[PDB]
Amino acid sequence: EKLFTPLKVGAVTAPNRVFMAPLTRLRSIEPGDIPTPLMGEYYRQRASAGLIISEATQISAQAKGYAGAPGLHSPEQIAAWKKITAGVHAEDGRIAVQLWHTGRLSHSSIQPGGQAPVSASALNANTRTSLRDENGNAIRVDTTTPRALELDEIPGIVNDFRQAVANAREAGFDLVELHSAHGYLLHQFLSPSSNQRTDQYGGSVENRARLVLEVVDAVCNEWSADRIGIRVSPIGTFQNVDNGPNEEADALYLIEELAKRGIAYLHMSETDLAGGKPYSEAFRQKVRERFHGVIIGAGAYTAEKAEDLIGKGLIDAVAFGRDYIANPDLVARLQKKAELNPQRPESFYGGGAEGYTDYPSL
Numbered sequence: 001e002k003l004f005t006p007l008k009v010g011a012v013t014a015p016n017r018v019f020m021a022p023l024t025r026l027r028s029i030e031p032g033d034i035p036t037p038l039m040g041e042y043y044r045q046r047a048s049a050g051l052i053i054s055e056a057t058q059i060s061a062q063a064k065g066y067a068g069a070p071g072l073h074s075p076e077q078i079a080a081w082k083k084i085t086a087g088v089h090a091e092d093g094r095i096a097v098q099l100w101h102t103g104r105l106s107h108s109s110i111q112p113g114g115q116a117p118v119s120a121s122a123l124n125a126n127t128r129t130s131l132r133d134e135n136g137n138a139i140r141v142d143t144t145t146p147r148a149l150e151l152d153e154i155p156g157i158v159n160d161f162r163q164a165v166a167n168a169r170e171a172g173f174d175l176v177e178l179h180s181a182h183g184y185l186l187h188q189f190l191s192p193s194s195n196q197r198t199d200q201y202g203g204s205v206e207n208r209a210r211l212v213l214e215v216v217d218a219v220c221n222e223w224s225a226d227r228i229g230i231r232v233s234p235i236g237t238f239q240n241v242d243n244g245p246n247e248e249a250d251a252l253y254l255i256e257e258l259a260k261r262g263i264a265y266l267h268m269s270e271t272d273l274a275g276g277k278p279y280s281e282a283f284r285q286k287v288r289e290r291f292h293g294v295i296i297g298a299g300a301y302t303a304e305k306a307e308d309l310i311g312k313g314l315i316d317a318v319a320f321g322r323d324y325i326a327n328p329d330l331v332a333r334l335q336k337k338a339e340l341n342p343q344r345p346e347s348f349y350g351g352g353a354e355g356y357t358d359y360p361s362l
């Protein structure tokens, strides 16, 4: 049973291959987008994971797209995350921070100055984000049409990722995961659907990948390549952002470039919750031969599917999302073949301890 064997993930050694996927839970304090001791307890409960990957976390105030999502840009955010990572370490866990900029998947009412959010191009996401009502409860609101970033603004985006990585290292995270998936800002540049630019950041796949590779380079230089992972969702459609008409070839180009940086891991989000066609074995093989770090697979996995693909040498670890929401001791449950707790989806987003810290261990 390879799932319960160790794995070196860049600078860290995970004791098992059962990872906690990044899960937005929208329970942070406003004003200030501040993580809380409740969040600290939730992560501490899950510290037996081979690796915890945190909820997506803003690199800056401009990055915010969801009310209740935390940041890693302010002194008060850094101080709060320091307590959270210390708690995970006291339980012998390891924790990466997933860092995002939401780009156009946002609303003006939560942006600095109440202005339109930014993106590769001035195209509405045509979906909804989560705000809070006057009682502090989560509500789904249509996205605001973004403004296209000017060329002279792109270095500031890269610097915001760099600074957020400095902050993450200071805050005690073991690794960083760049959120280059699911229709957020980096994916908005990668995708020809959302990126209609005609400068060096749009058009060719090389230009579409330019921003994410500049970010990768900047964060590797700020910390170390063996502390950097990246999440991609490069096959299919995620939150209305497709991967264009040459999605496999474009994915392999990006993966070959990422491999050159010697980063710690590639995390592939294979499907959204509504499902879609499975990755082909041939595509998995093409990814594996191009990337020489850890590959994490995610998206409706079972322990059996994970074991199959680990045993075939195609991936190294699996990230579970909803099963980690509901099972703090998922590792022990999978190892013992125990039943899993029933999930309560109504409390995934927003609220308090109920549906968050009240799922029991075995």
Ligand SMILES: Cc1cc2nc3c(=O)[nH]c(=O)nc-3n(C[C@H](O)[C@H](O)[C@H](O)COP(=O)(O)O)c2cc1C
Binding pocket: 021, 022, 023, 024, 025, 054, 055, 056, 098, 179, 181, 182, 231, 269, 271, 272, 298, 299, 300, 301, 319, 320, 321, 322, 323, 348, 349
């Ligand atoms: C409530 C919820 C929140 C999520 N938040 C994030 C997130 O912040 N970042 C991310 O990359 N994926 C996020 N996802 C996707 C999950 O990381 C995971 O890839 C997905 O849940 C599919 O896997 P599963 O079948 O194991 O749940 C979220 C999923 C759910 C259900």
